[PDB]
Design a protein around this ligand. Structure first.
Ligand code: HEC
Ligand code: HEC
Ligand code: HEC
Ligand code: HEC
Ligand code: HEC
Length: 142
């Protein structure tokens, strides 16, 4: 269990993977998805706050760096078929500004029809009125 190493320090509930990715198979190796598949690997300096592991929806990494990890498994063509606005956001805002992957359910998969339009308004309006908007880290929808 390669996840057990992380869970020696991290909280198995809130920092455990309890969303859909807990039950999926990694298309690259046909094994269960592990922590490092999304976060990469800690260095000896990990506890100090260094650019070792990936951090999602936080200011440390550029949008392109954050989102590229998802694309080690996901396919841009298929994302379009699921939800058109994906393409224009792939390089522009953190995937995790919308998706929540650690909890038992993802906020995006439960949105009503109205909610799927309100997210556009909420974040685009924030960009117009918030001088400190940072596309790498948006707490708005959380
Ligand atoms: C203790 C020896 C740890 C082990 C083993 C792992 N993690 Fe860790 N992690 C630890 C600390 C004390 C911190 C805080 C560092 C800081 O920024 O001040 C972290 C941080 C993370 C994060 C970032 C969370 C955040 O605050 O934004 C992630 C995503 C993370 N750690 C992941 C992670 C993974 C994938 C691990 C196994 C490969 C792992 N950690 C092990 C402590 C320790
Ligand atoms: C492989 C190690 C993956 C990485 C890295 C990421 N995802 Fe993933 N995800 C993966 C699989 C095999 C599946 C099942 C569907 C499929 O494409 O085969 C998923 C599923 C999702 C979903 C949908 C969950 C649902 O409600 O059905 C979402 C929203 C999703 N994934 C998002 C996502 C994001 C934002 C990622 C980077 C932070 C990411 N995934 C990485 C495999 C893998
Ligand atoms: C809000 C504007 C979003 C951002 C930014 C990202 N995603 Fe998304 N995604 C969003 C919604 C509302 C949905 C549900 C679509 C539906 O009709 O139910 C999704 C879906 C996905 C999926 C699942 C697709 C499927 O086959 O069912 C995946 C794998 C996914 N999203 C991944 C993903 C990635 C990798 C993103 C950053 C590049 C990303 N999403 C951003 C809303 C939003
Ligand atoms: C993608 C499929 C992931 C896998 C597998 C793991 N993590 Fe993750 N992590 C991912 C995202 C998109 C986020 C942002 C929040 C969200 O739920 O969407 C995170 C967050 C973390 C954090 C920070 C938690 C916080 O500050 O609230 C930590 C410490 C963390 N992740 C660690 C971690 C561990 C130990 C994992 C294996 C059990 C693990 N992650 C898997 C994406 C994904
Ligand atoms: C942050 C949490 C966002 C949410 C939710 C949505 N959008 Fe967005 N969008 C966001 C950023 C940071 C940018 C880049 C702005 C820039 O100046 O480059 C965008 C961009 C768009 C675009 C641009 C298309 C283009 O001219 O190429 C469109 C058409 C767009 N966004 C639409 C859109 C929709 C329909 C959303 C709800 C599903 C939505 N956005 C949500 C940030 C965020």
């Amino acid at each position: 269990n390669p996840d057990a190493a992380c869970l020696d320090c991290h909280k198995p509930d809130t920092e455990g993977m309890h969303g859909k990715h807990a039950s999926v198979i990694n298309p690259n190796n046909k094994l269960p998805v592990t922590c490092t598949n999304c976060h990469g690997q800690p260095s000896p300096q990990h506890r100090e706050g260094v650019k070792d592991v990936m951090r999602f929806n936080e200011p440390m990494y550029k949008v392109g760096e954050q989102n590229s990890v998802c694309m080690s498994c996901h396919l841009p063509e298929q994302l379009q078929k699921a939800f058109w606005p994906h393409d224009v956001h792939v390089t522009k805002v953190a995937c995790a500004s919308c998706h929540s992957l650690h909890p038992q359910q993802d906020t995006m998969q439960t949105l009503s029809d109205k909610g799927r339009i309100k997210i556009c308004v909420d974040c685009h309006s924030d960009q117009r009125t918030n001088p400190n908007f940072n596309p790498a880290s948006v707490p708005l929808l959380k």
